[PDB]
Amino acid sequence: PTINQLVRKGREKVRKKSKVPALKGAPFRRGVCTVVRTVTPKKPNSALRKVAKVRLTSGYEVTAYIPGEGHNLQEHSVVLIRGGRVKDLWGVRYHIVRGVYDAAGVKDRKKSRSKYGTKKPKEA
């Protein structure tokens, strides 16, 4: 562009769209489970992935992932949405935080315990 052209038109600052409307700019939203179901993943994999339809405090209905091995969630349980999505799944944009609300943590998990929300067991 000529300089004069820059003085005329300028340069366009480019905005990014949020990968997450948990709205509020909030780190988490509380919601209620609607449907708690299983889903098959995208083309390169196969599995049965565990998900919930959640109706948020934020007005939105969204599908959230339920990480870890076991889970206790069912149609009316209230849950916490933490955001971050699931790649090989269709339209799952947020994860459920385990250990919070009616989400239990993951029973018997010894390893990365704070993800999955389980307490430190005692020893003998």
Added chain:
Amino acid sequence: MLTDPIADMLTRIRNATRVYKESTDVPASRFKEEILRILAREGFIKGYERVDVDGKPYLRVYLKYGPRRQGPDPRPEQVIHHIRRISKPGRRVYVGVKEIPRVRRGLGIAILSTSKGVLTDREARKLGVGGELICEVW
């Protein structure tokens, strides 16, 4: 009409030397004379003469280069390795004294036009003035 005469000079020099021409003519202006005189004084050209081509005034710039070299490509190290415009018409650039560039870690120069005349960055600093930053050479 050349839109920037001064650039046209600088470039005439650029292409000239990049083919190792021994001298080159540029249409004469007193200002160009000044710029030249700075280069000459600074060891960048050999010097220049006022001259006459088809009855129109030019300044003939005599160029210098390094020795011949060995291996493939014997071609000589340029003495003006780099020469470029800074102020141009349509973006004019003026530095105050504290804003006067140092060039190539001192090994180069910048030529500024000032109300004290045309001087090298060192010259201008010692004179304690700023002005229109014409070009840098190294």
Added chain:
RNA sequence: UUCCCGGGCCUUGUACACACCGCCCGUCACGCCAUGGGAGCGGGCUCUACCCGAAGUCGCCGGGAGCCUACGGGCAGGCGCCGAGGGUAGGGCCCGUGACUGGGGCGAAGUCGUAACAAGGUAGCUGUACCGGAAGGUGCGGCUGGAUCCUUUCU
């Protein structure tokens, strides 16, 4: 030595590279999903014209129609302008809901063909125009980003 099969060397086009048993286009049906458009309703804000109009300041009256009076004036009271807001009729925006819906994703590549890539088997592409289950065909004009100098699908 044309042809069929297998093969060697040179060259050429390629969108092929698990490499032509390669690649690949479009239409259809009923699920299910998340979008986008969207008449009609419901809420809001706004603007225009008209009508109503609190409080208050200002303006006038202030009168043998009230109070004070040193008769100079004062107060009360009244009336009017403006005026928050309200009403009627309208143009605009926004939110909600929403009949009806386009294109997409997943079913499964499922279905019909074989349109493009090798001269892709009618070189392709293109603006346009008509036409056809569908990729498409055809007319006109243009482009080279075109090979070389019977028809015969798919994997």
Added chain:
RNA sequence: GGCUAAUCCCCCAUGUGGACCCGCCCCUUGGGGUGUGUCCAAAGGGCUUUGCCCGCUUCCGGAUGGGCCCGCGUCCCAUCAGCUAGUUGGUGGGGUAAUGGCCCACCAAGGCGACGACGGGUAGCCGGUCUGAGAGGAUGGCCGGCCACAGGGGCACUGAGACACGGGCCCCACUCCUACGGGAGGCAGCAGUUAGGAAUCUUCCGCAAUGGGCGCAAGCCUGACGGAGCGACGCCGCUUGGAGGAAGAAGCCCUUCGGGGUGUAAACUCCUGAACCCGGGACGAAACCCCCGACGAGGGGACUGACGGUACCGGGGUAAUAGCGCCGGCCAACUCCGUGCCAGCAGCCGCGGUAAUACGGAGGGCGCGAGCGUUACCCGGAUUCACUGGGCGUAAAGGGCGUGUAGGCGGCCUGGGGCGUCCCAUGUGAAAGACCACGGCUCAACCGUGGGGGAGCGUGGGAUACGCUCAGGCUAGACGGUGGGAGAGGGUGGUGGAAUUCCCGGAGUAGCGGUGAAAUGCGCAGAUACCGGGAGGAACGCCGAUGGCGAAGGCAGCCACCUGGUCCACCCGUGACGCUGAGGCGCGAAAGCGUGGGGAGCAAACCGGAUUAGAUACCCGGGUAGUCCACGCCCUAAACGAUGCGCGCUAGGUCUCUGGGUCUCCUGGGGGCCGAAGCUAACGCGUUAAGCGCGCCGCCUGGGGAGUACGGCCGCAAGGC
């Protein structure tokens, strides 16, 4: 309804002075002085009572705090392009501390806008903060400055000051009281409650300090404030021990079954002594006040803590919490077992379909550590909006072409101005912060004192190279004169031969045509092949090119007219008159549209004949729109050099078109091919740049969705932008 005091209200006086009309003087927007005239003052109280105090009144200054006005800076969308009726000015007036359409009356017809008005969206602004090498991006909690609000909307009253958060009026919504007439509220003060939310504290102590209001004081008030409490929210300090201790226990893990590992780690020995107990125990506090002196200066005296028995000092004294992430690559850290596209992981690349360092546990290891991770968000990396610091032949990206409007840009010399530019001085740039230094809490965090720096803007002074401006010159650019050209450049008229089709006529007869093969079709009403004649429409063979012209689209027989561009020569005239160009306007192949003509050949559609599995096709026979003309629309394109225009500069070789020249050759202007330097991702480009540079315009920012939707504007439509 009645009584009554005052530092409450009024009247007469005094007029230092001040205010107002008018005149003069000085000064210059309403500043200062002066003269006559009119108008305007007061309030008492206390005493250590003949003087001193706390006050009052008028005026002039000061200080401090404000009001109003101006230059400049201050987010996004032009899919917001026009907005404007007190609107723009004038006069007179109202209003105010004061200017002002601030308000009114009358007059005029203005004011604003692509330098983005109007409209929509969002938003308190700043000192600063975060990030970044910087430039820049992001931000404005806490602290300080400014503004604005005080349930929503209006309004004024009092007052030096308000249009007033704990003042007043009204309308509205809500809560509460009510005897249904009518009333009372307003935590965005401190606490606290409730709702909402992922989430944000004690209904604490104190008036001792600093500060604020009233009071002569003593004092009173002060959820300002000084403190304490809760929260790993942040930051900083510190603990969970220190030294010794095996060729190295058990356990566990690995194992080639030899051994390797956790590891001096433990056990154990010695030592120190977080916690905790005892004793002492602050600073922050000296004023106001009292006494002498004079209620001054000065000197002396007294009282006074929330924090708190806190910090701190002394003594005593116990070996005394460790956790979280990670170990496929980016990235520091590997093995066993389990699982077998499952269960699960996942930031991207991607792991899992029986030998998984990628899932899950374990052993081991790496990293941080009272934390460690995760989510969200900002800057970063991202030179991925490129000022620094990118690009557009084929990757995204040159507008289809021109004309020129605004705007950007401007050859050589001289002089004036000194606006841009640069310099010196000065003013400002508060404090806090950032920076450096010293210092104070045992360090630090935190804090204090000092110092430095600095953009910007104001004023004064100076410089004049460059940029501008004015003046005056020049001719190297540009245009003009004359002379010599070439050309399918354009518009209008005419007109020429070849061929096709049709008609007419002759002669002639059994087929012609067409294909891979055929058929449809045409032919005995006599076709095809041949001759003559007429009609008509379209297009111009050879020349013709590897050519020329044109801005592009495009432009081909000949003639005449009308007319545009352009190259060379002479070096004659003008004297910078220049380049580019958003917008506007004009042009713009084909197809398509409208009206009217025309219609020989061709030919979408269509009608048939074949081929095929089908054949809504390719092949064959027909054939309508259309193709042609006039006029008016349409505005597209592989509108391709996929390469904007102009100028200057950088080896050559060769072929060509068109000028000039002493005509091997040279010198211009176009078209081609190889190629120096150089560029380029390569391919390639290379004096016809894709090289080196300047000016200006257009455009690009991953693919799909999509040239789509919506909006607007064009268009008769189709459709275009």
